[PDB]
């Protein structure tokens, strides 16, 4: 003795049910080991991938931010915002593309800078990070009063900056601390490439179509 409730005959939905096997007694080919199984998309966010900071109105030349001897010591090399879901430099990264499949995200990110110039080149850069509320610094001296790092080409060929937290915002700018120094018979201009990634605490919510 049973009674039928208001939700009976509907298939409208994402419900996880059980159907009948269409071919009972069929044996699928057994499993063998295949290297490289990835069980979560959230650890694909954590690999560093090249970030198009240039993206000015070019091809593979959009991936690298040029640096040279600019004859004016304190100057702004480049800048980019830190939100991965927004249209911009982060569309080229893998963390930015799989944020477009979700509604919300939160956590910490890191950014890595590689200097590609010659072994003979020497100089310093100033890399600053402005919190979500504040507008970007107007001058080099305003940028050093907050979070920053001074980075030296000769001593250090790569540097990392962990931005502390973000939600679906923060701006990071690069300043010339010194002029670009070279010995004779050496090329005067070089490049830098940025790599975006997400940290361990980064999370995602409510999947959506891209």
């Amino acid at each position: 003795p049973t009674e039928l409730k208001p939700g009976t005959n509907q298939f409208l939905t994402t419900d996880d049910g059980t159907s009948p096997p269409i071919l009972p007694g069929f044996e699928p080919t057994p499993l063998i080991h295949i290297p490289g199984e990835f069980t979560s998309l959230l650890d694909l966010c954590q690999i560093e991938t090249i970030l198009e900071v240039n993206n000015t109105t070019i091809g593979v030349s959009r991936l690298l931010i040029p640096v040279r001897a600019q004859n004016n010591v304190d100057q702004l090399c480049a800048s980019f915002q830190v939100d991965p879901g927004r249209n911009g430099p982060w569309q080229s990264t893998m963390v930015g593309q799989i944020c477009r499949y979700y509604t919300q995200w939160s956590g910490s990110l890191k950014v890595t800078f590689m200097f590609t110039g010659s072994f003979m080149a020497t100089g310093k850069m100033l890399i600053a990070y402005t919190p979500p509320g504040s507008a970007q610094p107007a001058t080099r001296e305003a940028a050093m009063l907050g979070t920053h790092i001074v980075w030296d080409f000769g001593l250090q060929s790569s540097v990392t900056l962990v931005i502390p937290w973000i939600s679906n915002t923060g701006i990071v700018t690069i300043w010339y601390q010194t002029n670009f120094v070279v010995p004779p018979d050496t090329p005067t201009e070089a490049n830098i490439i940025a790599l975006g990634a997400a940290q361990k605490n980064f999370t995602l919510k409510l999947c959506k179509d891209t």
Partner: protein, 203 residues
């Protein structure tokens, strides 16, 4: 230092070739000019002609192996620029349209092939995200060499060496080569590949 692809060493699952087939095979040197874009070898194809490895792979019916591949670059301290080396499993190239890719593009041989459109990797996928595959960097100021070990990855236990290519090796110059006048124009890029734990069946 050294990249294990997907965290594993190659291993056996047939006749097992010994030292004759497991030696280093040094391919002819590529010259990287300031104007140059890209190369891809896409082996097992590259060794099917050369040496004892090529003898086994042609006359046996089924095939399994894994490879150590060492990429290294000779430049002075007045040269700059950076390379990216990646090993991409099931790397399927495409045609750009004004349509099938030609066999010389799909199976380039022992001399590799040039990228037309490195920015899309000639697959229509961004080069920015090619770092998801096993990869290494060569920055002429930091280092001259890159090394990657690739275990055998396929859906089947064995497969044919001539029809199916398991992966491909791409060497791309993201940051171009610049040098002041008087320096050597071309910077040589040489490629040495040693197969590991290779098995053949069905002579």
């Amino acid at each position: 230092n050294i990249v294990l692809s997907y965290g594993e060493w190659p291993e056996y699952c047939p006749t097992r070739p010994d030292v004759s087939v497991n030696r280093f095979y040094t391919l002819s040197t590529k010259s990287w000019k300031t104007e140059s874009t890209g190369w891809y070898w896409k082996f097992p194809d590259v060794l099917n002609d050369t040496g004892v490895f090529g003898q086994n792979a042609q006359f046996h019916y089924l095939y399994r192996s894994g490879f150590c591949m060492h990429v290294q670059c000779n430049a002075s301290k007045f040269h700059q620029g950076a390379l990216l080396v990646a090993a991409i499993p099931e790397f399927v190239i495409a045609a750009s349209s004004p349509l099938y890719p030609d066999f010389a593009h799909t199976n380039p041989g022992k001399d590799g092939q040039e990228f037309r459109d490195p920015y899309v990797l000639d697959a229509g996928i961004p080069l920015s995200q090619a770092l998801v595959f096993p990869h290494q960097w060569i920055n002429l100021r930091t280092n001259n060499c890159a090394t990657i070990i690739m275990p055998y990855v396929n859906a089947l236990p064995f497969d044919s060496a001539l029809n199916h290519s398991n992966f491909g090796l791409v060497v791309i110059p993201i940051s171009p080569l610049k040098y002041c006048n008087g320096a050597t124009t071309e910077v040589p890029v040489t490629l040495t590949i040693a197969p590991l734990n290779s098995e053949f069946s069905g002579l």
